[PDB]
Amino acid sequence: LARVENLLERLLQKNPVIKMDDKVVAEVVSRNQANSFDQYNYTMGGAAYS
Amino acid sequence: ITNNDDLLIFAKKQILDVPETALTIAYKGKEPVSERDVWYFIHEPMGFETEVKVTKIKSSHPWSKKFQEIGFSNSRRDMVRIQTQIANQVKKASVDTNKINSFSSIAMNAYDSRILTEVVGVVDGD
């Protein structure tokens, strides 16, 4: 059972840090904001950028 | 406008002298909420005992189990609203410039004809 403990310790070594990308998050946020902007423009007729 | 009472009422309309507040409530009751009904809000820890008029609703499907979000006294700031305001102001400025370009051009157009009339009168004077 000692090697089970050794493997569990080695598996506890792993850093609990999960790097998450920022460029894709920004692009998705921009797309959703654009959807909201288009909705608001449509509800205002055409008195906006387009 | 030219008189003073109209300018007084316009100036009164031109400012806002109370804190701008917006209220948001997460409601999970059985009674449905419509777009016209006025409810009574009681919330002791936040010092609320008043009548609230619904101005914004974000409802879920009746089978969706989710909460409802209800707004009162206008909405939170948000950026997309600011962008829409800036865009409509830009459009208004653009159309104003387009109109004023033609106005200046016809100012030049109304110029030359009257110059011709002045020249005709000058020749008549001689």
Answer whether B1's CB lies under 8 Å from B8's CB. Answer: no
In angstroms, the CA A16 to CA A8 distance is 15
Q: Experimentally, how was this structure solved?
A: cryo-EM
Give Cα B27 distance to the centre of its chain: 29
Helix (H, G, I), strand (E, B) or coil at A26: helix
Q: Residues 75..114 of B with a Cβ closer than 8 Å to A: which?
A: 79-81, 83-84, 87-88, 90-91
Closest-CA residue of B relative to A34 is B80
Residue written as token pair 């609230």: B52
Taking the C-alpha atoms of B35, B40, B42 and B46 in order, what is their torsion angle to the nearest 10 degrees? 50
3-class secondary structure, B64:
coil
**Whether the Cβ atoms of residue B49 and residue B41 lie closer than 8 Å to each other:** yes
Question: Residue B68: beta bridge partners?
Answer: B27
Identify the burial level of B120 via C-beta atoms within 10 angstroms of its C-beta, where 0-12 means exposed, 13-18 middle and 19 or more buried. Answer: exposed
- Resolution, angstroms, 1 dp: 2.9
> If DSSP codes are grouped into helix, strand and coil, which group holds residue B58?
strand
3-state SS assignment for residue B100 = helix
d(C-alpha B66, C-alpha B72), whole Å = 20
Residue B84's CB: how many other CB atoms inside 10 A? 21
Query: The tokens of A39 are what?
Result: 């909705």
Residues of A in CB contact (< 8 Å) with B are 33, 36-37, 40-41, 44, 47-49
Among residues B32, B126, B122, B88, the alpha carbon closest in space to that of A49 is found at: B88
Distance separating alpha carbons of residues B70 and B75, to the nearest angstrom = 10
Of B68, B74, B75, the closest CA to residue B30 belongs to B68
Helix axis angle for B79-125 and A23-43, nearest 10°, is 60
Q: Determine contact, residues B73/B22, Cβ cutoff 8 Å.
A: yes
Three-state secondary-structure class, residue B94: helix
Residue A9's H or E segment, with its range, is: helix A2-12
Nearest to A49 among B79, B81, B87 (CB): B87
Report residue A19 CA to chain centroid gap. Answer: 11
Question: Tokens representing A7?
Answer: 């493997």
Contact B91 A47 (CB under 8 A): yes
State the alpha helices, DSSP H only, in chain B.
4-13, 79-125
